[PDB]
Symmetry: C3
Subunit: 253 residues, 3 copies
């Protein structure tokens, strides 16, 4: 409930995990998810934790996301099947994957004190990053842990720009009276995965006023994943020689 | 051919894989790809499959993508080197990585009946998701499988918005006659990886009609990955005091 | 190290998924593949300082998969830290769409390493735009064993929201009076951006009267936050504006 609404990165397989060392083939980051449990009657599937091979203050597990995230919280947990756990750690992170920074300038963060009781650390300020690493500093018995990172949900957009949709010179809006429309169908360069929203705005206006009034419009109609109808219009007595517009279409998720 | 034009997710290393349990370190998700084969003369490299440590109806393999996909098909295959395979399974998925859903409300999907013959399951309706999981329900011999997920190709955009490109007060469009332009160089905050398309549209207009006609334009010229020239223009006898535009530049893939 | 300053180290930053054709056993896997990976040299049980294949033939490979396209500048190859095994030549293959794959140099060999620890960088003849890329060993000393890295240009990520048809209303307050006049329409984004967006906001419907032949209209966002902005329609001088409409495009970076 402290982390309700947040994305559990490891649980959802949203990040790639790299470790400094693994004790062996059954003590790897495959076993690192919070609350990970294995077959307790068979020894061959190894530890309920990631466990390092070298025991010093230079070990770490790195979580990597290609899509930037807002990190709210890191949860630490000990090993489920033996009395080993990390009592303090530091956190490092990177947004651009070139420069790295240390949380709290590398100061220790409180870890856990038993096998199974989870300890959440909410970052002093939420951390915007692509990659993040837990660096154990002190430990009981061995460097062995399970963990989770909690991030705000992310949204993904795909945008297409289309330039210069045009009525043509001396278009049908240049005569007549009342509401009048000229329809130019538009097909997007590629079909969207989901239904887009479309901005469509003027870049060239060639029109005549009517009793000093300007009346022009452009609007999408019948938007689909594949395209839309670009509707240029005027109304009343106005005569419009030509109109041009550019579009921006964006689909979410 | 049934999956022509689709992305093979595991084969392209486009997803992260987490499993519930692994029989040991040579029975893991590293050996999960459809048609994975290993050294048949050596036992030490393990199974031609992912195989669980615990044999019950609570096991799973999860595939996670940070970029949402449209899942068309899941393929299942047995274990290559022994008579073990999954005869049915359920599919669970999440788009937002907060709430999870079950395909067919959790009802079983038909699996395989031998070691090597792939069984494709095209989803009743394509599934929009970040993460998706195979949850074995029934099996022959052991919970052991190879698999693939087939997705529509994805497209990736990067967009930069720039605000308030302006002619100047009393610009050179406000005198003379015939085609006249005012060119304002625009540099993107960052250089795009590939060539962008630019929408460039009005947000402020200060102009005089000529025999009741309005005549105003704005268009990019010389678009590069680094910037473009914003060309404001008028023609005929029109006098335009000032013009302001906002731009949206998007590059694909 | 200098030669790749400023570039993203993909494996080091855990920015790709790694799949291998085969692993010698569970302690010779891609978990051991990062350039300069070193392990416990006193204990044998943690395996090799390298990914090592199980099948020794020309069909082996390690594939690095990125969901976001990257510009790959360089691939670095290194031999096995703890034993005299290394890859002496290899070929590179890649894909941008993850449907069609291509061979770098039409499949000609690229020069590898000659020892355990001396890294050999190969900067691609032209930089490669790709999602997935693979190292295919062609010749080797002892066994198919390697550590590696891929170097890419930094990526930028944007998130964009388009909102349509922000409207003053018919016969709005801009249609009376004199001097600078504004109509403010508050706009809330469908979802809250992670960081402050920049906002384009542009006309799609104009209904206005000139003043001594002049048109004077504008629209501008004010008080942009992660959650929304104030859409400010305005006119000035003596112009009477019946109505104006606009669509917006808001984009936040990184
Ligand atoms: Ca244009
Ligand atoms: Ca503006
Ligand atoms: Ca509109
Ligand atoms: Ni991964």
């Amino acid at each position: 409930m402290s982390t309700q609404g947040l994305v559990q990165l490891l649980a959802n397989a949203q990040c790639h995990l790299r470790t400094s060392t693994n004790y062996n083939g059954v003590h790897t980051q495959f076993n690192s998810a919070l609350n990970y449990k294995n077959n307790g009657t068979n020894t061959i599937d190894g530890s309920e934790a990631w466990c390092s091979s070298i025991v010093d203050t230079n070990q770490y597990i790195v979580a990597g996301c290609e899509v930037p995230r807002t990190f709210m919280c890191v949860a630490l947990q000990g090993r489920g099947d033996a009395d080993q756990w990390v009592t303090s750690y530091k956190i490092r992170y990177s947004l651009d994957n070139v420069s790295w920074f240390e949380y709290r300038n590398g100061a220790a963060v409180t870890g856990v004190t038993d096998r199974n009781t989870v300890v959440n650390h909410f970052f002093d300020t939420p951390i915007r990053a692509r990659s993040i690493a837990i660096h154990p500093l002190t430990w009981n018995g061995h460097i062995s842990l399970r963990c989770e990172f909690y991030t705000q949900p992310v949204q993904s957009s795909v945008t297409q720009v289309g330039a210069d949709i045009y009525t043509g010179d001396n278009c049908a809006l240049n005569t007549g009276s009342g509401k009048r429309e000229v329809v130019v169908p538009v097909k997007f360069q590629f079909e969207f995965a989901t239904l887009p929203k479309v901005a469509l705005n003027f870049d060239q206006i060639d029109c005549t006023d009517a009793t000093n009034q300007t009346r022009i419009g452009v609007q999408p109609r019948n938007i689909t994943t594949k395209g839309f109808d670009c509707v240029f219009y005027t109304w009343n007595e106005n005569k419009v020689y030509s109109l041009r517009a550019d579009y921006i279409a964006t689909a979410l998720e």
